[PDB]
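[worker-b] picked up task from shared queue
[worker-b] task type: protein-ligand structure
[worker-b] ligand name resolved to IM9; SMILES cross-checked against name lookup, match
[worker-b] sequence length check passed
[worker-b] input payload:
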Amino acid sequence: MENFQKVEKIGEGTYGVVYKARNKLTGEVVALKKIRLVPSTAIREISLLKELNHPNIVKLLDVIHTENKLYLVFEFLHQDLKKFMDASALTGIPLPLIKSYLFQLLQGLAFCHSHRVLHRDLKPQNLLINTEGAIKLADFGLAVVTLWYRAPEILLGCKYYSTAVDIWSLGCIFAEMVTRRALFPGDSEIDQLFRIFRTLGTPDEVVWPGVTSMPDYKPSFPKWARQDFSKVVPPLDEDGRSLLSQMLHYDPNKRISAKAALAHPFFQDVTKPVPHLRL
Ligand SMILES: Cc1ncc(-c2ccnc(Nc3ccc(N4CCN(C(=O)CO)CC4)cc3)n2)n1C(C)C
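[worker-b] inference finished, payload out:
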């Protein structure tokens, strides 16, 4: 760690704290994550991530493990998607750029999921962008906390959840890019669930076989009727609404995979625009 010079603080979680830093050595500018006070298991899983290289995953350059404390050195990107969404709020992110970002993140996920790696905690704050029009997944949740992008199976207590949880999260993010408003902004676990239920209908055995035997399922849940998607993400076009609805299917088994999503007609005219970024 003597090799790095802190420049500024760019993040905090209960993983750790992240700094923009400069290799004292030889000026790589990097993001430096100082991790949570390290068991053998953590080291090996993290070393597995160092091999998970893809253009749409923030590159893990190095793992420094000396003295019990753990540091992760990443390629630095200049902005997160949240700040870009906030900056773009009056006009909205143009659809071609939303679509490009969505396609790229689905490519990232397809790759991760093909290697049996789940993100688990997708949100605007851990999607990072650069001037070239790339978007990248960061802060792989390698297991106040935001619940807004949590899949319903997690909220209902599924222990052994699947790659579909990331598709759900990404769907919520897609909706948010389009409407410029969080789809399901819950501030507790039951509020989050009930916000989902109010929009998508209270799930039952018809749309989600086995839902009623999930650990935190309660028969006493209020029974809300589903709303139509034309109300939920106007003025998104039919292709986009079709894709979104498949990304938000209650049953993780019916939820569209990253790979199948890339073949959706919504991406027929996909391009790679450059965002105008003010750094
Ligand atoms: C967690 C984590 N692990 C590694 C990274 C990472 C990797 C590569 N590049 C970055 N760059 C960032 C991240 C965040 C920000 N902004 C966050 C929001 N912000 C604030 O001032 C918030 O108050 C401005 C900086 C700028 C560059 N991170 N991160 C990010 C998501 C904080």
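[worker-b] attaching auto-annotations
[worker-b] The two ends are 27 Å apart (CA to CA).
[worker-b] releasing lock
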